Ligand binder design. Sequence first.
Ligand SMILES: *[C@@H]1O[C@H](CO)[C@@H](O[C@@H]2O[C@H](CO)[C@@H](O[C@@H]3O[C@H](CO[C@H]4O[C@H](CO)[C@@H](O)[C@H](O)[C@@H]4O)[C@@H](O)[C@H](O[C@H]4O[C@H](CO)[C@@H](O)[C@H](O)[C@@H]4O)[C@@H]3O)[C@H](O)[C@H]2NC(C)=O)[C@H](O)[C@H]1NC(C)=O
Ligand SMILES: *[C@@H]1O[C@H](CO)[C@@H](O[C@@H]2O[C@H](CO)[C@@H](O[C@@H]3O[C@H](CO[C@H]4O[C@H](CO)[C@@H](O)[C@H](O)[C@@H]4O)[C@@H](O)[C@H](O[C@H]4O[C@H](CO)[C@@H](O)[C@H](O)[C@@H]4O)[C@@H]3O)[C@H](O)[C@H]2NC(C)=O)[C@H](O)[C@H]1NC(C)=O
Ligand SMILES: *[C@@H]1O[C@H](CO)[C@@H](O[C@@H]2O[C@H](CO)[C@@H](O[C@@H]3O[C@H](CO[C@H]4O[C@H](CO)[C@@H](O)[C@H](O)[C@@H]4O)[C@@H](O)[C@H](O[C@H]4O[C@H](CO)[C@@H](O)[C@H](O)[C@@H]4O)[C@@H]3O)[C@H](O)[C@H]2NC(C)=O)[C@H](O)[C@H]1NC(C)=O
Ligand SMILES: *[C@@H]1O[C@H](CO[C@@H]2O[C@@H](C)[C@@H](O)[C@@H](O)[C@@H]2O)[C@@H](O[C@@H]2O[C@H](CO)[C@@H](O[C@@H]3O[C@H](CO)[C@@H](O)[C@H](O)[C@@H]3O)[C@H](O)[C@H]2NC(C)=O)[C@H](O)[C@H]1NC(C)=O
Ligand SMILES: *[C@@H]1O[C@H](CO)[C@@H](O[C@@H]2O[C@H](CO)[C@@H](O)[C@H](O)[C@H]2NC(C)=O)[C@H](O)[C@H]1NC(C)=O
Ligand code: NAG
Length: 490
Amino acid sequence: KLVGFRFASYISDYMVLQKEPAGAVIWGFGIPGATVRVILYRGQEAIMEKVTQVKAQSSNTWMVVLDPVKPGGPFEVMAQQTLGRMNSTLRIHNVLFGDVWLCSGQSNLKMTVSQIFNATKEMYNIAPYQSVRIMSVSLVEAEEELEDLTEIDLPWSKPTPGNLGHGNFTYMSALCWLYGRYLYDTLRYPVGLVSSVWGGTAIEAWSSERVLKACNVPDHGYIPEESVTGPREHSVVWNAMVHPLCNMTLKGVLWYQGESNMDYNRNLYNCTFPALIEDWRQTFHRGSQGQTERFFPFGFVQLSSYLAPPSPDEGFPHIRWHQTADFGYVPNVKMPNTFMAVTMDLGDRDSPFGSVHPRDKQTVAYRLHLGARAVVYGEKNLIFQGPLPEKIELLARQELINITYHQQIQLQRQDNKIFQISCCSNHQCKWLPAPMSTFSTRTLTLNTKPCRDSVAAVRYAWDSWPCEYKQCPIYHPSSTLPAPPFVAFI
Ligand SMILES: *[C@@H]1O[C@H](CO)[C@@H](O[C@@H]2O[C@H](CO)[C@@H](O[C@@H]3O[C@H](CO[C@H]4O[C@H](CO)[C@@H](O)[C@H](O)[C@@H]4O)[C@@H](O)[C@H](O[C@H]4O[C@H](CO)[C@@H](O)[C@H](O)[C@@H]4O)[C@@H]3O)[C@H](O)[C@H]2NC(C)=O)[C@H](O)[C@H]1NC(C)=O
Ligand SMILES: *[C@@H]1O[C@H](CO)[C@@H](O[C@@H]2O[C@H](CO)[C@@H](O[C@@H]3O[C@H](CO[C@H]4O[C@H](CO)[C@@H](O)[C@H](O)[C@@H]4O)[C@@H](O)[C@H](O[C@H]4O[C@H](CO)[C@@H](O)[C@H](O)[C@@H]4O)[C@@H]3O)[C@H](O)[C@H]2NC(C)=O)[C@H](O)[C@H]1NC(C)=O
Ligand SMILES: *[C@@H]1O[C@H](CO)[C@@H](O[C@@H]2O[C@H](CO)[C@@H](O[C@@H]3O[C@H](CO[C@H]4O[C@H](CO)[C@@H](O)[C@H](O)[C@@H]4O)[C@@H](O)[C@H](O[C@H]4O[C@H](CO)[C@@H](O)[C@H](O)[C@@H]4O)[C@@H]3O)[C@H](O)[C@H]2NC(C)=O)[C@H](O)[C@H]1NC(C)=O
Ligand SMILES: *[C@@H]1O[C@H](CO[C@@H]2O[C@@H](C)[C@@H](O)[C@@H](O)[C@@H]2O)[C@@H](O[C@@H]2O[C@H](CO)[C@@H](O[C@@H]3O[C@H](CO)[C@@H](O)[C@H](O)[C@@H]3O)[C@H](O)[C@H]2NC(C)=O)[C@H](O)[C@H]1NC(C)=O
Ligand SMILES: *[C@@H]1O[C@H](CO)[C@@H](O[C@@H]2O[C@H](CO)[C@@H](O)[C@H](O)[C@H]2NC(C)=O)[C@H](O)[C@H]1NC(C)=O
Ligand SMILES: *[C@@H]1O[C@H](CO)[C@@H](O)[C@H](O)[C@H]1NC(C)=O
């Protein structure tokens, strides 16, 4: 109905488009049946040209896929609209080509540069990162999937101190920006960061109907008040803030979510999250006409610490577990081409926003940058996963449990209460603290004395607030990566 020739909403000046091998997609609206010519200029020279015609059927859209472009810039992109004796031209300037990353999640990734530690110096450190272009999607929800973005908080723009730290939970994600900054330090070519994030949302709002069907999520349509403070309805956030973007070619996705699922559909998270990334991969693949990799990188953050009221069953450790598909590490078979950052040891007790919103986002960006370099940018043989036990065995006569880790381990502190084992007597189990007894470069021996001989399972770091800041027991000496939490059965 709106027949005004225009680019898509997220196509503006200063943007970053996807680089070779993938081809950037340029689409917009116009008059049905009119002809559209999209020309890419390097300076004043027209490097390339594609031709298409605006759909005469329902969509009312015109779309071209450019040829692979080499990272760099600046470029210009022009679209010309012609029909009969009617002529129109659109031009966007200072376009760059490089790796585009989509950041989404809830309030912890909404947190801005102005809100984190060392805020001012990070805010004003942009001089070497002017080719790290940024955009923040405004909060909109919709009952049905949308073809275009309704509302944009921060259009494509070069980073400045003001737009980096532009308020409380507003413009630029500290995590997204810092991660893109590490990425630019490494890659040294243009990076684009599009952040569409809504605080206090459950993963159901971010998933389409397909994931809900695949995981048999209860079709309440609504979600317990306190658990989630944002849009309850299913898939609305996805419909209005992520679906329109799936026609943009992007390098990868950064994801920080799970806090709102601690007490809502907890036990289905190990289904929904892998299903979510898979559905996003497929939908972006078809939306960009195959330009986005069908298995594009999906880097995510494991939930951080949280000072929580005492509870018999805490959701946070369960969600930390389910975020790995109950496997303890990524990438794994259920999540190929994915990297993770463990953040439970980066707890902030005195944060003004809450224990759940720690201000140390630089360390998170560093660990995510390790994961990305290893999994995505061919920096193999770089330690990006924390020490995880390859072998667990039980010595019933010695009343011990011998655990051996794949990587060498280094002891930062002993915690009698961090290791817990389950005591199933009369076939009724009970979780009890198991103190560490012996330690070695690659193995440690736990003690069973409090549980007699009915041992069934062990678990490590299964508390919402497991340790104090950067003070967890087990660490890698070289990589400064913490031993991730886990549960194992005997
Ligand atoms: C509070 O926040 C500020 C702002 O971010 C931090 O200060 C920056 O910290 C980063 C990271 O330490 C510094 O970046 C490093 O700079 C070194 C040289 O930078 C100078 O020289 C280059 C030209 O060579 C100039 O372009 C640049 O502007 C600087 O003048 C690099 O050598 C570093 O890279 C390598 O270092 C290690 C090895 O030691 C490698 O392992 C790395 O992978 C990497 O390859 C790095 O790029 C930056 O210079 C700091 N200053 C500013 C103004 O940003 C504070 O650290 C932070 N403080 C606290 C307490 O949180
Ligand atoms: C994604 O993650 C979720 C949560 O981790 C998984 O859902 C649970 O998975 C576990 C393990 O597969 C299931 O546990 C089974 O529970 C049975 C009884 O359940 C009752 O008791 C528990 C607690 O006591 C209550 O919470 C529950 O509501 C019921 O009242 C046990 O009988 C099972 O054990 C039997 O078989 C095993 C097989 O080896 C023996 O070792 C045991 O001794 C015993 O004979 C088992 O413990 C649990 O039922 C699942 N649901 C819930 C709500 O907890 C998903 O499976 C997981 N999905 C994927 C794909 O990873
Ligand atoms: C960017 O890439 C994405 C990739 O998905 C594309 O998104 C697709 O957009 C179209 C919109 O045209 C979506 O298709 C629409 O689905 C409607 C509802 O489907 C459900 O409900 C119907 C009955 O209610 C069932 O039959 C069906 O099986 C589903 O269960 C259809 O009703 C739509 O057709 C009707 O809508 C238009 C209104 O615009 C009418 O004018 C038509 O005449 C027709 O009656 C339509 O098919 C599609 O679902 C989206 N993809 C996905 C995966 O969901 C974008 O199109 C693409 N953008 C560009 C510019 O290329
Ligand atoms: C960004 O947010 C911080 C944190 O505040 C908390 O989180 C926000 C998301 C909101 O939900 C806030 O309602 C919430 O408290 C803000 O810090 C707060 O700053 C204000 C003003 O500087 C402080 O208010 C005053 O505090 C003095 C104490 O000396 C009282 O006497 C006054 O009457 C008045 O209440 C407030 O204490 C402070 N809160 C915390 C927890 O530190 C911050 O202002 C905000 N910044 C911007 C730019 O919006
Ligand atoms: C716990 O398991 C580890 C792992 O095997 C044992 O350490 C091994 O000890 C043998 C002794 O001959 C060495 O040859 C291996 O090289 C050791 N492995 C490693 C990784 O160091 C350890 O002895 C076991 N401890 C107990 C009490 O059973
Ligand atoms: C549209 O106008 C521009 C500038 O006047 C011109 O270069 C172009 O050839 C025109 N296209 C038509 C008339 O189809």
